[PDB]
Q: What sequence folds into this?
């Protein structure tokens, strides 16, 4: 056998009694350094996951405490670290700043501003590795988290305190779902209702810096940064930073949750945090498992995603919705990390490339999408229209094979095909054009009552637009009634009937 | 400082230092070699030993050979004097033309630009290729990828781009050939000399070449990309000017990294890849960027092992690119060249607010018709074409016309096809596809559209086909 | 780290690392001869059947082993270097390869005092005069001050002649190899 | 495990080649007919 601290330098020190002038309790000497992993001798009083600081100004996290040495993962390039360096304890587990002083600021995995807008306020700090809530603090998910997307709000409802999952392939629209969700919250944040405001956190793990810069420009254009934090852990960042960034975001959001406010955190992309952790584990010589991932990679994501809760009024009532994004490779939802996170979360928005190019953008594939919360996370009006819409779409999906033939089939199948095509053309949405819930319910109500069975499918996307502009301009009282009331009252139902008929009465 | 080789295993050399160690990434020079062998430090193993990867053959090394420590990473000559030359990873010239006489040497390892330097502006780069311009338009200052297996057209397409963009491009240009056939390196050298971008007489050369071809040991292939990237970075910053940067392939960088990882003591990852695949690729692809001080248009050819787009290397590379053009073998078998897959290619600027509503709508109509054609092909395998709804046959006819019309003859593929190269301005491509979709050509036969430039050439080819009928 | 002075001959392995540590420690403070003598002493001290039986049992705690070794070292009045080396080998549980460490340090010290082991192989024994001229010529091979350490084995497997090893240098004036050479070249 | 559009011609088995030929023969026939019509129109429009 052999140890890594049995090198002849340490033994030389210890033979001639030179090991008493060195403080091996709060300082250590690097034995090895390579591929971002340092092996340090000493630091006998160092805690697991504690942050140590190297002589050359770098930081590191001490992960592997073995009898001989400490395995530190360096937070940057190991160019500056040389064998024999001096590593000092910091004394505290890694923590990040939190507060409303972060809103509108781009930060890195450790809370340092990287947008060059000046120091970061940072009144309070919070440890990233904090246990999630328990059984008792939570209460069932009841409030809706308005995504602003017709498909997601109609057929895959997302509540507050829920862990959805935007799972899809490459270049299908996942980041677009996330950004539309972030941008749609301006109508609530601008207003005065203090229990509808949602604060957004966007964790960008492993994306190149140009992508994040364009994303920040997009948010600024939509004036949606004043309530957004962006935590960047881009590709050039060391593996430990990509590994921590989800936890920094989750703690910056747990701050809002603990104080009665509501937050939305979008871990984009989790399949890259898994890769960074895989790197760190393999370089620390930890035993690999399936696909070379460490054994505790389910633990890594579960202890992160189980912090998305809906606290009860005895704790504040705040909440932290989570929208982890995962990129499946071909369609393989049976791979390792997709499997883990599908078994961890509460639903999934499954995106397609067949649907993306068939013209159905957003490419949300209903039937594979699910929300185990469901109607509990919908408003009464949205429930009323979405029950029928979902039933009709389900009927349409089992006779969609005949869609090509269509004719030479009974009248019931013809009607199913026609209604399904109209509904699918209805769920189509632009980009960065979310819609208030009243708009969505008006449009879907028009669709699902047959008032479009006469229009040609190619004209439904133009109808939707013109009708929506009409109602938004002429009829604000009805929309306001539906919004504030939350339901479709009989008088409001009659008003919607007359409006839809009058606009459709002449459309051409 | 002076050290001493203590082990040689393959391309990995362990060097022991009695004085202070050299920092990681430093270049060390082996003493006693007829040529120049440069090792690069990769790890500190303790007991004063440092592991290193050799940038050249480690044959004839003797346990005990003295080694010098240069004190800095590999420093290459940079400046306007490198234009028209060729270089190794370590910067020495391999064009048999004399020393590169510069005043600036740049280290090949540097930190990536910070977030406060990113440009956020995008404007289409018109390349003159119908499929690229229509469905996956490029962008000035953006990073382009050319995925595809072996034998699909990566090299031909990249040569075509050099022919078009580089020839009529005011700024400079750089070509880093990473782990590719040396025959192709020589062919490019001579083609460039003929065209005139490389001028051996005057000082008017517009291209600097760096070559790390596939006869080199893994250490040199893993670093020639950084050498070319350093030349491009200097031209971006100090010259303060536009630059192009072509790389072929950027999969050999990853692969060369994988050929030494096991010997450096790292456990392998998913499929015989190094554990540091994503980090190693990111620390390189993050210096190929358009900062606010300059602008690099980067075109990268990316080998996809066995056409598998889900392999870890191409899969990871996908996230570092603005535009991608996934060349497909299933389309190259059909004779459609370039074999760019219209449904598997994407661009960031492909939005109605960047290109325009006409361009965007034409592109989306083409993609939708091709996807519908794919859906129909399953039915035609059972019914037959004779049994389709008289509307479906219209979709199939339009889809086949559009499939053929995306093919185009290059000026560099004259030898293969024998045809003549065509450059199609963007408006002409948009008009052609808008007309083909609108039905203004549903009488001309399919083959009229095969390997032609603008649509009028298809009309003329159909006229000729009819006359000699 | 402390710039240890390297030994002349590099011994490798666990014993190599421990012995190189000891040699570097002794070379500074200049206690190589005394420490070698103490190592030879502990070579027998630990070999005692009682001590060996009490140190090869891994169920006596390392604490008891270290205490017993401290008592023995005090009872033998050793240098602090050798006492610390024994303590270090005991803590790390490396007692089962202590004789390997002593052998390594012996090899390392022999080269320090300038010795090049030599081997001579012949079919039969030699007359002392011939061995004397062999001594002279082999000393001719060596450098200045490099004492020789001759070993004269007798191998009848070879058919005659002589075989000489001086360090890594090798000269084979043996009948067998020349028979082999002629048989092979002639066979071609 | 699912199925996607345009998979019969992605496998390239017997059905893939059969479908490719069933398409090519039909469109060669239609191209011949259209070329004949194009020649007729050419001749009829000279004057």
A:
């Amino acid at each position: 056998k052999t140890g890594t601290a049995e090198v002849s330098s340490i033994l030389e020190e210890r033979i001639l009694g030179a090991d008493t002038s060195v403080d091996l309790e709060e300082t250590g000497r690097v034995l090895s350094i390579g591929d971002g992993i340092a092996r340090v001798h000493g630091l006998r009083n160092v805690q697991a996951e504690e942050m140590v600081e190297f002589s050359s100004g770098l930081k590191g996290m001490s992960l592997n405490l073995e009898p001989d040495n400490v395995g530190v993962v360096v937070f940057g390039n190991d160019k500056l670290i040389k064998e024999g360096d001096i590593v000092k304890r910091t004394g505290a587990i890694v923590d990040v700043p939190v507060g409303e002083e972060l809103l509108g600021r781009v930060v890195d995995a450790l809370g340092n501003a990287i947008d060059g807008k000046g120091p970061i306020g940072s009144k309070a700090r919070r440890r990233v590795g904090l246990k999630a809530p328990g059984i008792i603090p939570r209460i069932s998910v009841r409030e809706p988290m308005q995504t602003g997307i017709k498909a997601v709000d109609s057929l895959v409802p997302i509540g507050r305190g829920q862990r959805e999952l935007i799972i899809g392939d490459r270049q299908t629209g996942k980041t677009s779902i996330a950004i539309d969700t972030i941008i749609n919250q301006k109508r609530f944040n601008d207003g005065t209702d203090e229990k509808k405001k949602l604060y957004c956190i966007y964790v960008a793990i492993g994306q190149k810096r140009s992508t994040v810069a364009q994303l920040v420009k997009r948010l600024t254009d939509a004036d949606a940064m004043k309530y957004t934090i962006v935590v960047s852990a881009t590709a050039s960042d060391a593996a430990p930073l990509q590994y921590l960034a989800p936890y920094s975001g989750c703690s910056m959001g747990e701050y809002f949750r603990d104080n009665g406010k509501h937050a939305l955190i979008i871990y984009d992309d989790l399949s890259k945090q898994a890769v960074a952790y895989r790197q760190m584990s393999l370089l620390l010589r930890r035993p690999p498992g399936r696909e070379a991932y460490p054994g505790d990679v389910f633990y890594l994501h579960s202890r992160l995603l189980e912090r998305a809760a809906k606290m009860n009024d005895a704790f504040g009532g705040g909440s932290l919705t989570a929208l982890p994004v995962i990129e499946t490779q071909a369609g393989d939802v049976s791979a390792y990390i997709p499997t883990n996170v599908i078994s961890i979360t509460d639903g999934q928005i499954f995106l397609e490339t067949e649907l993306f190019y068939k013209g159905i953008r957003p490419a949300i594939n209903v039937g594979l999408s699910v929300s185990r919360v469901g109607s509990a996370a919908q408003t009464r009006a949205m429930k009323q229209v979405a029950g029928t819409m979902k039933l009709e779409l389900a009927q349409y999906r089992e006779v969609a094979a005949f869609a090509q033939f269509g004719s030479d089939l009974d009248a019931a199948t013809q009607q199913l095909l026609s209604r399904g095509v109209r509904l699918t053309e209805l769920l189509k949405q632009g980009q960065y054009s979310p819609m208030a819930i009243e708009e969505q319910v008006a449009v879907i109500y028009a669709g699902v009552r047959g008032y479009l069975d006469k229009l040609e499918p190619s004209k439904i996307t133009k109808f939707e637009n013109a009708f929506l502009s009409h109602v938004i301009s002429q009829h604000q009282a009805l929309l306001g009634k539906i919004r504030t009331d939350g339901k479709i009252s009989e008088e409001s139902d009659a008003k919607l009937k007359e409006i839809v008929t009058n606009f459709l009465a002449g459309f051409e | 400082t002076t050290g001493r080789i203590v082990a040689v295993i393959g391309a990995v050399v362990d060097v022991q230092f009695d004085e202070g160690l050299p920092p990681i990434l430093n270049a060390l020079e082996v003493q006693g070699r007829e040529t120049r062998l440069v090792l690069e430090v990769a790890q500190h193993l303790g007991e004063s030993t440092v592991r290193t990867i050799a940038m050249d053959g480690t044959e004839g090394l003797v346990r005990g050979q003295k080694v010098l420590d240069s004190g800095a990473p590999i420093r290459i000559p940079v400046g306007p004097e490198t234009l028209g030359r060729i270089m190794n990873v370590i910067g020495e010239p391999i064009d048999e033309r004399g020393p590169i006489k510069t005043k600036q040497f740049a280290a090949i390892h540097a930190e990536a630009p910070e977030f406060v330097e990113m440009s956020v502006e995008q404007e289409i780069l018109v390349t003159g290729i119908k499929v690229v311009d229509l469905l996956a338009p490029y962008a000035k200052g953006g990073k382009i990828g050319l995925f595809g297996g072996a034998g699909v057209g990566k090299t031909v397409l990249i040569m075509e781009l050099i022919n078009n963009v580089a020839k009529a491009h005011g700024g400079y240009s750089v070509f880093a050939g990473v782990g590719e056939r040396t025959r192709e390196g020589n062919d490019l050298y001579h083609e460039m000399i003929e065209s005139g971008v490389i001028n051996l007489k005057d000082a008017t050369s517009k291209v600097a070449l760096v070559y790390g071809q596939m006869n080199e040991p893994p250490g040199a292939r893993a670093r020639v990309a950084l050498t070319g990237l350093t030349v491009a970075e200097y031209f971006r910053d100090q010259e303060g000017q536009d630059v192009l940067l072509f790389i072929d392939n950027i999969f050999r960088f990853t692969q060369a990294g994988s050929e030494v990882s096991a010997l450096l003591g790292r456990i392998p990852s998913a499929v015989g890849y190094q554990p540091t695949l994503a980090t190693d690729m990111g620390t390189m692809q993050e210096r190929i960027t358009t900062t606010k001080k300059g602008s690099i248009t980067s075109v990268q050819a990316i080998y996809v092992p066995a056409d598998d787009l889900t392999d870890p290397a191409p899969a990871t590379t996908f996230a570092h690119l603005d535009a991608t053009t996934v060349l497909s073998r299933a389309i190259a078998e059909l004779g459609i060249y370039p074999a760019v897959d219209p449904l598997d290619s994407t661009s960031r600027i492909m939005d109605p607010n960047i290109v325009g509503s006409e361009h965007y709508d034409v592109a989306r109509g083409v993609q939708k018709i091709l996807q519908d054609y794919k859906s129909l092909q399953d039915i035609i395998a059972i019914l037959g074409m004779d049994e389709l709804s008289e509307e479906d046959k219209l979709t199939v006819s339009r889809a086949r016309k559009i499939q053929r019309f995306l093919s185009q003859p290059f000026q560099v593929a004259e030898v293969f096809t024998g045809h003549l190269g065509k450059l199609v301005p963007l408006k002409e491509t948009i008009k052609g596809f808008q007309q083909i979709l609108a039905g203004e050509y549903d009488h001309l036969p399919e083959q009229a559209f095969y390997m032609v430039g603008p649509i009028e050439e298809a009309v003329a080819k159909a006229d000729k086909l009819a006359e000699e009928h | 780290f402390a710039k240890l002075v390297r030994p002349p001959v590099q011994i490798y392995g666990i014993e190599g690392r421990y012995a190189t540590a000891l040699y570097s420690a002794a070379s500074k403070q200049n206690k190589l001869e005394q420490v070698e003598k103490e190592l030879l002493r502990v070579g027998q001290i630990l070999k005692e059947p009682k001590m060996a039986a009490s140190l090869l049992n891994p169920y006596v705690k390392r604490s008891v082993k270290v205490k017993s070794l401290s008592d023995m070292t005090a009872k033998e009045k050793f240098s602090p270097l050798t006492s610390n080396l024994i303590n270090l080998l005991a803590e790390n549980g490396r007692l089962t390869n202590t004789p390997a460490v002593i052998s390594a340090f012996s090899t390392m010290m022999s080269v320090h005092r300038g010795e090049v082991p030599c081997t001579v192989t012949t079919a039969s024994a030699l007359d002392e005069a011939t061995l004397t001229e062999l001594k002279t010529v082999l000393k001719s091979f060596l450098s200045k001050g490099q004492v020789l350490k001759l070993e004269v084995k007798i191998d009848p497997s070879i058919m005659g002649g002589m075989i000489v090893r001086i360090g890594e240098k090798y000269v084979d004036m043996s009948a067998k190899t020349k028979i082999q050479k002629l048989s092979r070249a002639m066979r071609e | 495990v699912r199925s996607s559009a345009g998979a019969v011609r992605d496998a390239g088995g017997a059905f893939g080649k059969r479908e490719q030929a069933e398409e090519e023969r039909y469109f060669r026939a239609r191209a011949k007919e259209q070329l004949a019509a194009l020649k007729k129109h050419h001749e009829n429009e000279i004057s």
